[PDB]
Amino acid sequence: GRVIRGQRKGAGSVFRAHVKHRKGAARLRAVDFAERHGYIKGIVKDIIHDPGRGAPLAKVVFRDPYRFKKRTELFIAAEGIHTGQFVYCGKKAQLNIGNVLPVGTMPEGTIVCCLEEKPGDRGKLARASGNYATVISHNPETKKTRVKLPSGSKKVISSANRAVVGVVAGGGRIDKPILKAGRAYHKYKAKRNCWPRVRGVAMNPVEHPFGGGNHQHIGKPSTIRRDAPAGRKVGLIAARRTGRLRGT
RNA sequence: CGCGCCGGGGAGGUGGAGCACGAGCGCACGUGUUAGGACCCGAAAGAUGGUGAACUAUGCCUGGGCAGGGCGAAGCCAGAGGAAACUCUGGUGGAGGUCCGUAGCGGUCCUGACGUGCGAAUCGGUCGUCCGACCUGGGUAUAGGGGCGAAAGACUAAUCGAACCAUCUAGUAGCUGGUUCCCUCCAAAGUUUCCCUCAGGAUAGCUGGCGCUCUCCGCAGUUUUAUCCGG
RNA sequence: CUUGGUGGUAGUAGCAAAUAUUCAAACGAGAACUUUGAAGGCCGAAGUGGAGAAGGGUUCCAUGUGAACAGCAGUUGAACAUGGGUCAGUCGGUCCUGAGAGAUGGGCGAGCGCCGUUCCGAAGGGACGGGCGAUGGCCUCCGUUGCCCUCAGCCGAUCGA
RNA sequence: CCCGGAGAAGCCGGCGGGAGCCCCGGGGAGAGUUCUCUUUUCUUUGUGAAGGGCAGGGCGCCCUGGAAUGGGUUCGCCCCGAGAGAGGGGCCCGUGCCUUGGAAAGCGUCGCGGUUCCGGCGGCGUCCGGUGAGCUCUCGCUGGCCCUUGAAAAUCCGGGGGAGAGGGUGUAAAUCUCGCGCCGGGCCGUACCCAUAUCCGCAGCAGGUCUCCAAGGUGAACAGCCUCUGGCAUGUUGGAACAAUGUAGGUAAGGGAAGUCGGCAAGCCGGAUCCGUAACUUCGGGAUAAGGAUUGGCUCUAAGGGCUGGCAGCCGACUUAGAACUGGUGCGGACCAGGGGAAUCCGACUGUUUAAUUAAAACAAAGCAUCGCGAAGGCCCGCGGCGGGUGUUGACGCGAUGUGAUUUCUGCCCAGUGCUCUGAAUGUCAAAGUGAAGAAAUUCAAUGAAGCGCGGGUAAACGGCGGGAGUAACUAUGACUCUCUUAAGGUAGCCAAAUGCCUCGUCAUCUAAUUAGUGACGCGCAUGAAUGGAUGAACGAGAUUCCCACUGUCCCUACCUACUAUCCAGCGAAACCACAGCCAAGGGAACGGGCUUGGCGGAAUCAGCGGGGAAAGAAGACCCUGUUGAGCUUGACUCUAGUCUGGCACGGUGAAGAGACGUUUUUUCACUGACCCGGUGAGGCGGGGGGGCGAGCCGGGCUCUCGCUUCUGGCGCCAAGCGCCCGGCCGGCCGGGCGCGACCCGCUCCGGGGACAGUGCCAGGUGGGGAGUUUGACUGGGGCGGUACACCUGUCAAACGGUAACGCAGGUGUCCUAAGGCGAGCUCAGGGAGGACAGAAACCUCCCGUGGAGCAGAAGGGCAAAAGCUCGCUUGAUCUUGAUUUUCAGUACGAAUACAGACCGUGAAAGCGGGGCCUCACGAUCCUUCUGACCUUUUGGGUUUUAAGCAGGAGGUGUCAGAAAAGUUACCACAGGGAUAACUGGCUUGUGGCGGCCAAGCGUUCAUAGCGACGUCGCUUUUUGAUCCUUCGAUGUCGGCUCUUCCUAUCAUUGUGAAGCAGAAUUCACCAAGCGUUGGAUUGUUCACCCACUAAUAGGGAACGUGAGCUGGGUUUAGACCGUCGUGAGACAGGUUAGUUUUACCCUACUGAUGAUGUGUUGUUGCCAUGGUAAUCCUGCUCAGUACGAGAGGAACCGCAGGUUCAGACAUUUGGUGUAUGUGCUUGGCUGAGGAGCCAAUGGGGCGAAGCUACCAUCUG
Ligand SMILES: */N=C(\N)N(C)CC[C@H](N)CC(=O)N[C@H]1C=C[C@H](n2ccc(N)nc2=O)O[C@@H]1C(=O)O
Ligand SMILES: [Mg+2]
Ligand SMILES: [Mg+2]
Ligand SMILES: [Mg+2]
Ligand SMILES: [Mg+2]
Ligand SMILES: [Mg+2]
Ligand SMILES: [Mg+2]
Ligand SMILES: [Mg+2]
Ligand SMILES: [Mg+2]
Ligand SMILES: [Mg+2]
Ligand SMILES: [Mg+2]
Ligand SMILES: [Mg+2]
Ligand SMILES: [Mg+2]
Ligand SMILES: [Mg+2]
Ligand SMILES: [Mg+2]
Ligand SMILES: [Mg+2]
Ligand SMILES: [Mg+2]
Ligand SMILES: [Mg+2]
Ligand SMILES: [Mg+2]
Ligand SMILES: [Mg+2]
Ligand SMILES: [Mg+2]
Ligand SMILES: [Mg+2]
Ligand SMILES: [Mg+2]
Ligand SMILES: [Mg+2]
Ligand SMILES: [Mg+2]
Ligand SMILES: [Mg+2]
Ligand SMILES: [Mg+2]
Ligand SMILES: [Mg+2]
Ligand SMILES: [Mg+2]
Ligand SMILES: [Mg+2]
Ligand SMILES: [Mg+2]
Ligand SMILES: [Mg+2]
Ligand SMILES: [Mg+2]
Ligand SMILES: [Mg+2]
Ligand SMILES: [Mg+2]
Ligand SMILES: [Mg+2]
Ligand SMILES: [Mg+2]
Ligand SMILES: [Mg+2]
Ligand SMILES: [Mg+2]
Ligand SMILES: [Mg+2]
Ligand SMILES: [Mg+2]
Ligand SMILES: [Mg+2]
Ligand SMILES: [Mg+2]
Ligand SMILES: [Mg+2]
Ligand SMILES: [Mg+2]
Ligand SMILES: [Mg+2]
Ligand SMILES: [Mg+2]
Ligand SMILES: [Mg+2]
Ligand SMILES: [Mg+2]
Ligand SMILES: [Mg+2]
Ligand SMILES: [Mg+2]
Ligand SMILES: [Mg+2]
Ligand SMILES: [Mg+2]
Ligand SMILES: [Mg+2]
Ligand SMILES: [Mg+2]
Ligand SMILES: [Mg+2]
Ligand SMILES: [Mg+2]
Ligand SMILES: [Mg+2]
Ligand SMILES: [Mg+2]
Ligand SMILES: [Mg+2]
Ligand SMILES: [Mg+2]
Ligand SMILES: [Mg+2]
Ligand SMILES: [Mg+2]
Ligand SMILES: [Mg+2]
Ligand SMILES: [Mg+2]
Ligand SMILES: [Mg+2]
Ligand SMILES: [Mg+2]
Ligand SMILES: [Mg+2]
Ligand SMILES: [Mg+2]
Ligand SMILES: [Mg+2]
Ligand SMILES: [Mg+2]
Ligand SMILES: [Mg+2]
Ligand SMILES: [Mg+2]
Ligand SMILES: [Mg+2]
Ligand SMILES: [Mg+2]
Ligand SMILES: [Mg+2]
Ligand SMILES: [Mg+2]
Ligand SMILES: [Mg+2]
Ligand SMILES: [Mg+2]
Ligand SMILES: [Mg+2]
Ligand SMILES: [Mg+2]
Ligand SMILES: [Mg+2]
Ligand SMILES: [Mg+2]
Ligand SMILES: [Mg+2]
Ligand SMILES: [Mg+2]
Ligand SMILES: [Mg+2]
Ligand SMILES: [Mg+2]
Q: Closest Cα partner for A62 from A52, A71, A49, A50?
A: A71
CB-based contact A236:A223 (threshold 8 Å)? yes
Listed resolution, Å:
4.1
What CA–CA distance (Å, rounded) separates A160 from A101?
Answer: 9
What CA–CA distance (Å, rounded) separates A228 from A221?
Answer: 14
What CA–CA distance (Å, rounded) separates A44 from A100?
Answer: 14
Instruction: Report how far Cα A136 is from the mean position of its chain's Cα atoms.
Output: 21
> In the complex, which nucleotide's C1' lies nearest to the CA atom of residue A69?
D2
Backbone φ and ψ of A2, nearest 5°: -85, 170
**Strand B atom within 7 Å of A173 CB:** no
Q: Which residues contact A28 (CB under 8 A, 6 or more apart)?
A: A73, A75, A100, A114, A116, A122, A123, A162, A164
The CB density around residue A174, as the number of other CB atoms within 10 Å, is 10
State the DSSP H helix or E strand holding residue A189, giving kind and residue range, or none if neither. Answer: helix A181-191
Instruction: Report how far Cα A201 is from the mean position of its chain's Cα atoms.
Output: 32
DSSP category for residue A116: -
**Cα–Cα distances in Å, from A127 out to A14, A84, A162?**
27, 23, 13
**Strand D atom within 7 Å of A248 CB:** no
What CA–CA distance (Å, rounded) separates A122 from A11?
Answer: 29
| Identity of residue A171 | G
What CA–CA distance (Å, rounded) separates A68 from A237?
Answer: 56
Instruction: Report how far Cα A75 is from the mean position of its chain's Cα atoms.
Output: 14
What CA–CA distance (Å, rounded) separates A92 from A47?
Answer: 26
Instruction: Report how far Cα A203 is from the mean position of its chain's Cα atoms.
Output: 34
Cα-to-centroid distance, A12 and ligand 50 (Å): 42
What CA–CA distance (Å, rounded) separates A181 from A243?
Answer: 29
Angle among Cα A135, A154, A151 to the nearest 5 degrees reads 95
Backbone φ and ψ of A8, nearest 5°: -65, -20
Backbone φ and ψ of A33, nearest 5°: -50, -40
User: What length is written for chain A?
Assistant: 248
**Strand C atom within 7 Å of A20 CB:** yes
